[PDB]
């Protein structure tokens, strides 16, 4: 019972080659080089799927800091005051507030400053 | 009505063969052998120890000889006569072979292990002293061949 191993062999080839479309060079033409590229591609996708949540938090913090300093307050004091006030909006939607409607951001900065110690450098 | 396609092996009967060296998912590129050495390609004989004197060569040969003229006996204990013969009676070698107490063509010696209670007439190649006392103290008689 001899088998011709070509029906089964071609399946993963087609999978990997179809996944490797758009690759510049011979990484989209040859099954071996495309497979080598797919290894890196899926590890990189895992890595960046994990770090995307940090990149977006970085972006939100940067936008919030700029808007806060426009409102004449530092970012760190702003979120310290928001923690003190009990207003518990995350940095994502706090960035949507900074961009879309700045009046609510101004009011929220007012609340954060009102709920902040009379001396932030006091020994307490 | 069971047909040929209704037949199935008993659960747990058939195990799958371990096909080895068929990828890195299971057992690949070494087929469970690890890296190089003698064992990576052939084997080691079971009587090899690395060149030190083996276990079968540093120990003395067991003392004695074999005595090709040995007289071996197939042995029945007296307690089995009770079970085999609920009433006793005459009990030779060949009507003791039928009860599966000895092999078919061999010398038979009777030993006195269990407890014999029935009236029996035992004939055998040889007897034990305890067996003879048990046979005759239970009311029967024992004769050698």
């Amino acid at each position: 019972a001899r088998v011709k191993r070509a029906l089964n062999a071609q399946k993963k080839r087609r999978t990997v080659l179809k996944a490797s479309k758009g690759y510049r060079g011979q990484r989209s033409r040859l099954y071996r080089k495309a497979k080598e590229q797919q290894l890196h591609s899926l590890t990189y996708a895992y890595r960046d799927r994990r770090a995307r949540k940090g990149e977006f938090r970085k972006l939100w913090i940067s936008r919030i800091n700029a808007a806060a300093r426009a409102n004449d307050i530092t970012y760190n004091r702003l979120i310290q005051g928001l923690k003190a006030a009990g207003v518990e909006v995350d940095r994502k939607n706090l960035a949507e507030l900074a961009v879309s409607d700045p009046a609510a951001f101004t009011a929220l900065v007012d609340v954060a400053r009102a709920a902040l110690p009379e001396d932030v450098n006091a020994p307490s | 009505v069971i047909k040929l396609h209704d037949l199935k092996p008993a659960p747990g009967e058939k195990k799958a063969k371990t096909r080895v060296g068929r990828g890195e998912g299971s057992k690949g590129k070494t087929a469970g052998r690890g890296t190089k050495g003698t064992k990576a390609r052939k084997n080691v004989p079971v009587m090899f120890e690395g060149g030190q004197m083996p276990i079968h060569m540093r120990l003395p040969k067991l003392k004695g000889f074999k005595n090709r003229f040995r007289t071996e006996y197939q042995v029945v204990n007296v307690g089995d006569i009770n079970k085999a013969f609920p009433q006793g009676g005459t009990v030779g070698v060949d009507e003791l072979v039928a009860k599966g107490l000895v092999r078919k063509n061999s010398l038979v010696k009777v030993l006195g292990d269990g407890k014999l209670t029935v009236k029996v007439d035992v004939t055998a190649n040889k007897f034990s002293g305890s067996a003879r006392e048990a046979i005759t103290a239970a009311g029967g008689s024992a004769t050698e061949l």
């Binding site: - | 009505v1 069971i2 047909k3 040929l4 037949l7």
Partner: protein, 157 residues
């Protein structure tokens, strides 16, 4: 195998200096036309199961047919002196509607086995040759009086 294919005695070329893979003969397995490595060789496939296993399987299959009224006894398949697939087919059709039947007949009865041999679903076997495979194929088993008695008598002692 590697040593049975034609040729291959020579070492194909020098073992060093040529800039090519070290090759010991042209009939090596990796070559086209080379020897097969772990390839089939003739095998005897019979395995010897104990006698009472076989006998018990026979009895169990025949019991399975008997519990469901799939066993029939007949005096004979067709009135003798001449085979007739037409009349034997009609009688067997009265006797059963299913597709496959075992027709267990004594070896001497040739007129009967001749008249039932060409029916597409009908399998003819002798009582002393009865096995579990043929009875599990059959939807019905059709004995003759002689063959049923013969199977009973071969197992009555």
């Amino acid at each position: 195998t590697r040593g049975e294919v034609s040729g291959g005695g020579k070492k194909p070329y020098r073992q060093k200096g040529t800039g090519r893979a070290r090759q010991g003969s042209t009939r090596a397995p990796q070559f086209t036309g080379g020897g097969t490595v772990h390839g089939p060789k003739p095998r005897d496939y019979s395995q010897r199961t104990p006698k009472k296993m076989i006998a018990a399987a026979l009895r169990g299959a025949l019991s399975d047919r008997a519990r469901n009224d799939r066993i029939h006894a007949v005096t004979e398949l067709v009135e003798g002196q001449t085979p007739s697939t037409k009349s034997a087919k009609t009688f067997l059709g009265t006797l059963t509607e299913n597709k496959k039947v075992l027709v267990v007949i004594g070896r001497t009865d040739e007129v009967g086995a001749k008249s039932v041999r060409n029916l597409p679903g009908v399998h003819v076997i002798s009582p002393d040759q009865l096995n579990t495979y043929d009875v599990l194929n059959a939807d019905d088993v059709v004995f003759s009086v002689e063959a049923l008695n013969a199977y009973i008598s071969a197992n009555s002692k």
